[PDB]
């Protein structure tokens, strides 16, 4: 009925006037492969040190566990991560490889790594 | 104008198109363009509330299908005085 | 204020909305906004324990659906004196 | 010299190849190169509307097959005055 | 003490919660907070070998479920003099 | 030497290996290392077309299996004058 | 010595563990710790070929399980004179 | 105020009613009335984006049931300089 | 600001809530709070048309369930010049 | 303190009881008593957010069954400076 | 310019929206706006062929649903020198 810049981006905009919801919301050390430790050096628990070690059983209580996490209130949220990085883009879709049809002694290795000259042509 | 309208995008090309449509589409001044790191680029404008609503809507619609695309398009009609400390004043 | 309120987000638009909601909701001071990197933006506030608790709840709800969204909303009633050195004093 | 041609690539090698193809194809100036972060790189060129339509197409084709590739190819025929602030004038 | 204990986390909020937990848990002194990049924050403490181990385990538990979580937790009882050059001394 | 040879890798280790292999293979100048962001590290050389054709190929073969890998290996025998502004002239 | 040993890791905690293991294992000199970006952290050691080879092997095993793990572990017996410009001379 | 609000109608009576409704409803100056030909009469008003939005809505609601009716209601927040020389500059 | 927005409530506690929400939502001036008598209290604000709209929506939503409730939430884009005399300019 | 806690009742007897229970329970100063009219009485306290939250709760429980009863019990942790104009500074 | 772009619409509200979209999109000079009679309003823009193509496409898209509608959108790269006589040189 009324046209103008208001009609655009109906779902995308999040703002103050109408979007705001109303009245609603064997071995001494355990196998390296089959073991992973909380602390990763010096405090590693893989190796069964026997004696008066600094390890703590379930009977003792304090300094770790609920006695550390519970102190400070916290909340968590499901925000969306794409992880744009060189590692993440290591499987990015790519166009068909350039093909070399040069017929001269060009040192043209078509079995090695892709060396693209200007325009994306292989060489 | 004290209203704030921010549009966030993955990459710069969608942001510059969003800024172009945002400014062409109403009275708004491009106060800042911030690289958030990780790809995210935020372009934010200032103006009167009605103008910012039109500018933000134009930007979100324009840049929705440019490059990686739109992440956020948000409006704050009056940002608290504290928040002004973390907002750019003139474009850079 | 001793209490520290923290809200992390994926992008700057949710961070600004969170900071605006935090400051509006209660008596908090926006000590700093930090660009952690790789798309993370963290907003820090300091105030009395009661205010920070109210502000952080307002911030988490405000930015929950804005942009990529909220990562963490954390409250620390009293930081150890050592931690004070790694916290921003004033925003920039 | 008002049309803006922007090519965004994942990495810098495709960005440089796109820049070389764009400047070779048409009579366009390479205003700037920007590291958007997160692996994005954007190359912007300025020229006549026809020259920037040819350069962008030439650049997009060239950098498609180089490394991670092209994320976006965009043309802004008329660029608003405000946007000029966030547009680099010359390449650093 | 000279033993070094480090906790790595995704985002600054779990990093600060860790540093708060380690400092409060045992007799350790916070010495740095590094922004590794990519949304990774490392908090390093120094103290007696026993104290550092107790602090780091407490910190790991504390930041394990805050925000994007915990990446690593490490203690080096004795650090070679060479590695002292790539370690922060006092938090800035 | 006016030709340009660029190699982009995921990380600094393959980049340094690529840089070493290229400079050791032919008579080329290592003129820049560029942390593009998000891990991408571009190392680019300037030399004769034959020297840079043989340097880039050796570098690519050397850094392909090192670390995360090799993103792109590119050669531009003739570089447009405009693109010369966005190319390093000496190591950062 | 001129032999160069480079170890790349995801995060800093593995890098510090790697550097500690390397400097402890053999007579190598830690010359730099580079934050590549994207999370990668690269520690470079210079020494005699025998010492660097021993140092890198010890480092690769020590940091493999720490944090997000190891990305690369490389040895270059002789580094070209050109590359040494892009190699840090001493840690910072 | 640089926003333009236009309300076409069939016949003059709905146009005069729309012109009266729009000006009374909000702060908009009536730039003109053009007899488009074929029984279409367009009334154009200028003002702030928010004012024009209120005026145009009021005008459309007033002329909907007056005579033949409403053809178009449109709001242009920003008018390009070119379009100026085709609009009625003089209010009378 | 020409535009006027009035919220009427049963009691004063809802009126104060509406006034706080309105002034926080957008850029408006609380020009008066009137005790109509018989339980009604009317808080009315002045501002731009766009800001006033955003303000009254927030005020209506905020005070809807506080105390007895909300009686009326009215928006006038521009009052007649005559009605300006019976409107407060600053609160008593 | 700046947090505002308002309790509204039908009649003065519950309002005075609310003031007594509120002021006794926590550390909040009684800033105003307002006769809205129609039988409504409003008692206003100002204090720290934690202090105000305990006081409003105590007052509400206390006046809930005294006379006609409790119309409302509201807390505003931070009142906009505009609303400060319409609030009593001290009691009558 | 030589390229001629024409858009015909039913009424002046669909024509003004096109004219605004045309000149905004590309650097096209608006030469004429003709009331053909019978409720047809034609807008002619003159510019470069590349600029006119973008202008007409933008103009046609913007006013397809604005008012009674778009009749047609026609681009002529170069008109015969004879047809220049029946074209409007400047807007009325």
From Swiss-Prot, chain A:
Residues 85-123 are annotated as: Disordered. It is found in: Carboxysome. It comes from the Bacteria. Residues 102-116 have a biased composition (Polar residues). Disruption phenotype: Does not grow in air but does grow in 2% CO(2), called a high-CO(2) requiring phenotype, hcr. Cells do not make carboxysomes. Also absolutely required for carboxysome formation in E.coli. Required for growth in ambient air. Seen in gels as 2 forms (of 85 and 130 kDa, equal amounts of each) which have the same N-terminus, called respectively CsoS2A and CsoS2B. Partial tryptic digestion and mass spectrometric analysis, as well as the presence of the shorter form even when a C-terminally tagged version is engineered, suggests CsoS2A is shorter at the C-terminus, but its sequence is not known. It has been shown these 2 forms are produced by ribosomal frameshifting. C-repeat repeats lie at residues 27-67. Residues 93-123 are annotated as: C-terminal peptide (CTP). Transmembrane segments: none annotated. Expression of 10 genes for alpha-carboxysome (Cb) proteins (cbbL-cbbS-csoS2-csoS3-csoS4A-csoS4B-csoS1C-csoS1A-csoS1B-csoS1D) in E.coli generates compartments that resemble Cb, contain RuBisCO and have its catalytic activity, showing it is possible to make artificial, functional Cb using these 10 genes. Cargo proteins can be targeted to these organelles. Artificial Cb assembly in E.coli requires csoS2-csoS4A-csoS4B-csoS1C-csoS1A-csoS1B-csoS1D (but not the gene for carbonic anhydrase, csoS3). Belongs to the CsoS2 family. Has 3 domains; the N-terminal domain has 4 short repeats and binds RuBisCO. The central region has 6 longer repeats. The C-terminal domain has 3 repeats and a highly conserved C-terminal peptide. The 3 C-repeats serve as the encapsulation signal for the alpha-carboxysome (Cb), and are able to target foreign proteins to this organelle. Proteins can be targeted to the Cb by a single C-repeat, however more repeats yields more efficient targeting. The C-terminal peptide (CTP) is not required for cargo targeting and is probably on the outside of the Cb. Required for alpha-carboxysome (Cb) assembly, mediates interaction between RuBisCO and the Cb shell. The 3 C-terminal repeats act as the encapsulation signal to target proteins to the Cb; they are necessary and sufficient to target both CsoS2 and foreign proteins to the Cb. The N-terminal repeats of this (probably) intrinsically disordered protein bind simultaneously to both subunits of RuBisCO; minimally 2 N-repeats are necessary for RuBisCO assembly into the Cb in vivo. This is Carboxysome assembly protein CsoS2B. It comes from Halothiobacillus neapolitanus (strain ATCC 23641 / c2) (Thiobacillus neapolitanus). The lineage of its organism: Bacteria, Pseudomonadati, Pseudomonadota, Gammaproteobacteria, Chromatiales. The chain holds residues 712 to 869 of 869 of the full protein.
Swiss-Prot record, chains B, C, D, E, F, G, H, I, J, K:
GO terms for biological process: carbon fixation. Keywords: Bacterial microcompartment, Carbon dioxide fixation, Carboxysome. Disruption phenotype: Does not grow in ambient air, has a wild-type growth rate in 5% CO(2), called a high-CO(2) requiring phenotype, hcr. Fewer carboxysomes are present, RuBisCO is found to be soluble rather than in the carboxysome. Required for growth in ambient air. GO terms for cellular component: carboxysome. GO terms for molecular function: structural constituent of carboxysome shell. It is found in: Carboxysome. The keyword Transport does not apply. The major shell protein of the carboxysome, a polyhedral inclusion where RuBisCO (ribulose bisphosphate carboxylase, ccbL-ccbS) is sequestered. Assembles into hexamers which make sheets that form the facets of the polyhedral carboxysome. The shell probably limits the diffusion of CO(2) into and out of the carboxysome. Molecular modeling shows the central pore of this protein is selectively permeable to anions such as HCO(3) rather than CO(2) or O(2). There are estimated to be 2970 CsoS1A/CsoS1C proteins per carboxysome (the proteins differ by only 1 residue). The tight homohexamer forms a pore with an opening of about 4 Angstroms in diameter which is positively charged. Homohexamer with a small central pore; the concave side is mostly positive electrostatic potential, whereas the convex side is mostly negative electrostatic potential. Forms a CsoS2-CsoS1-RuBisCO complex. Interacts with the N-terminus (residues 1-136) of RuBisCO (CbbL). This is Major carboxysome shell protein CsoS1A. It comes from Halothiobacillus neapolitanus (strain ATCC 23641 / c2) (Thiobacillus neapolitanus).
């Amino acid at each position: 009925r009324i046209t103008g810049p208001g009609m655009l981006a109906t779902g995308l905009i999040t703002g103050t006037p109408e979007f705001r919801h109303a009245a609603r919301e064997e071995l001494v050390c355990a196998p390296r492969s089959d073991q992973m430790d909380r602390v990763s050096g010096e405090g590693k628990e893989r190796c069964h040190i026997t004696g008066d070690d600094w390890s703590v059983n379930k009977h003792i209580t304090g300094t770790a566990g609920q006695w550390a996490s519970g102190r400070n209130p916290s909340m968590r949220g499901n925000a969306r991560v794409v992880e744009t990085s060189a590692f993440a883009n290591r499987n990015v879709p790519k166009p068909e490889k350039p093909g070399s049809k040069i017929t001269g002694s060009s040192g043209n290795d078509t079995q090695g790594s892709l060396i693209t000259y200007s325009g994306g042509a292989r060489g | 104008g004290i209203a704030l309208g921010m549009i966030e995008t993955r990459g710069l090309v969608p942001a510059i198109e969003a800024a172009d449509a945002m400014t062409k589409a109403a009275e708004v001044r491009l106060v800042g363009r911030q690289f958030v790191g990780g790809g995210y680029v935020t372009v934010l404008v200032r103006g009167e509330t009605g103008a910012v609503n039109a500018a933000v809507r134009a930007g979100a619609d324009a840049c929705e299908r440019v490059g990686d695309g739109l992440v956020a398009a948000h409006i704050i009609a009056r940002v608290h005085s504290e928040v002004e400390n973390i907002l750019p004043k003139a474009p850079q």
